[PDB]
Curated annotation (Swiss-Prot):
Domain of life per record: Viruses
Location(s), subcellular: Host cytoplasmic vesicle membrane
Function: Seems to be essential for minus-strand RNAs and subgenomic 26S mRNAs synthesis. Displays mono-ADP-ribosylhydrolase activity. ADP-ribosylation is a post-translational modification that controls various processes of the host cell and the virus probably needs to revert it for optimal viral replication. Binds proteins of G3BP family and sequesters them into the viral RNA replication complexes thereby inhibiting the formation of host stress granules on viral mRNAs.
Amino acids binding ADP-D-ribose: 10, 24, 32, 112-114
Residue stretches making up the Macro domain: 1-160
Intrachain S-S bonds: none
Membrane topology reported for the UniProt record: Peripheral membrane protein
Domain statement: In the N-terminus, the macro domain displays a mono-ADP-ribosylhydrolase activity. The central part called, the alphavirus unique domain (AUD) has a zinc-binding function. The C-terminus region, also called hypervariable domain (HVD), is mainly disordered and binds several host proteins. This intrinsically disordered domain contains 2 SH3 domain-binding sites and 2 FGDF motifs necessary and sufficient for the formation of nsP3/G3BP complexes.
Residues of the full protein shown: 1334 to 1493 of 2474
Protein name: Non-structural protein 3
Effect of residue 10 to A: Partial loss of ADP-ribose 1'' phosphate phosphatase activity
Subunit annotation: Interacts with mRNA-capping enzyme nsP1. Interacts (via C-terminus) with host G3BP1; this interaction inhibits the formation of host stress granules on viral mRNAs and the nsp3-G3BP1 complexes bind viral RNAs and probably orchestrate the assembly of viral replication complexes. Interacts (via C-terminus) with host G3BP2; this interaction inhibits the formation of host stress granules on viral mRNAs and the nsp3-G3BP2 complexes bind viral RNAs and probably orchestrate the assembly of viral replication complexes. Interacts (via C-terminus) with host NAP1L1.
UniProt PTM comment: Phosphorylated by host on serines and threonines.
Lineage of origin: Viruses, Riboviria, Orthornavirae, Kitrinoviricota, Alsuviricetes
Length: 160
């Protein structure tokens, strides 16, 4: 009975069946979510490079790490970056489906270090809902700020 939920904690401490990394296309350790993901699941960075707008899963034993490459808005125009952000979340949905998992922990892609200095909460969440609505999995969205938790939570309530 699929749900959306939001948790304010380190995504590295998720209790879901797989995690989504906010990865770069070089498959390298980065800042933000990707740093916490590198610290926690370093093995998942073996051949994890994948282009912007795509997602690639690498297993960490039995644990899937979905490296999803949202655009860095410092690199992309708002227009093109929006296409890429939709594409990355679509591949996350694809990966979550192919793996058969019951749940997934996901950060808001293209926020923070890739945000180009803009608040992209609503933008990233909207693409997240659009893509994930066709999956059967419980989705647990992670964030770290209290204001964001409240806005995500309210966005969920008005949807479901």
């Amino acid at each position: 009975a699929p749900s959306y939920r939001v948790k304010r904690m380190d995504i590295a401490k998720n209790d879901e069946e797989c995690v989504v990394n906010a990865a770069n296309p070089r498959g390298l350790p980065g800042d933000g979510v990707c740093k916490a993901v590198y610290k926690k699941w370093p093995e998942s960075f073996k051949n994890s490079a994948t282009p912007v707008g795509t997602a690639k899963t690498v297993m960490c034993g039995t644990y899937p790490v979905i490296h999803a490459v949202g655009p860095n808005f410092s690199n992309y125009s708002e227009s093109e970056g929006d296409r890429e952000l939709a594409a990355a979340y679509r591949e996350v949905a694809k990966e979550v489906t192919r793996l058969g998992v019951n749940s997934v922990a996901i950060p808001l892609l293209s926020t923070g270090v890739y945000s180009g200095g803009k608040d992209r909460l609503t933008q990233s969440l909207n693409h997240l809902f659009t893509a994930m609505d066709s999956t059967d999995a419980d989705v647990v969205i992670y964030c770290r700020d209290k204001e964001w938790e409240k806005k995500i939570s309210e966005a969920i309530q008005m949807r479901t």
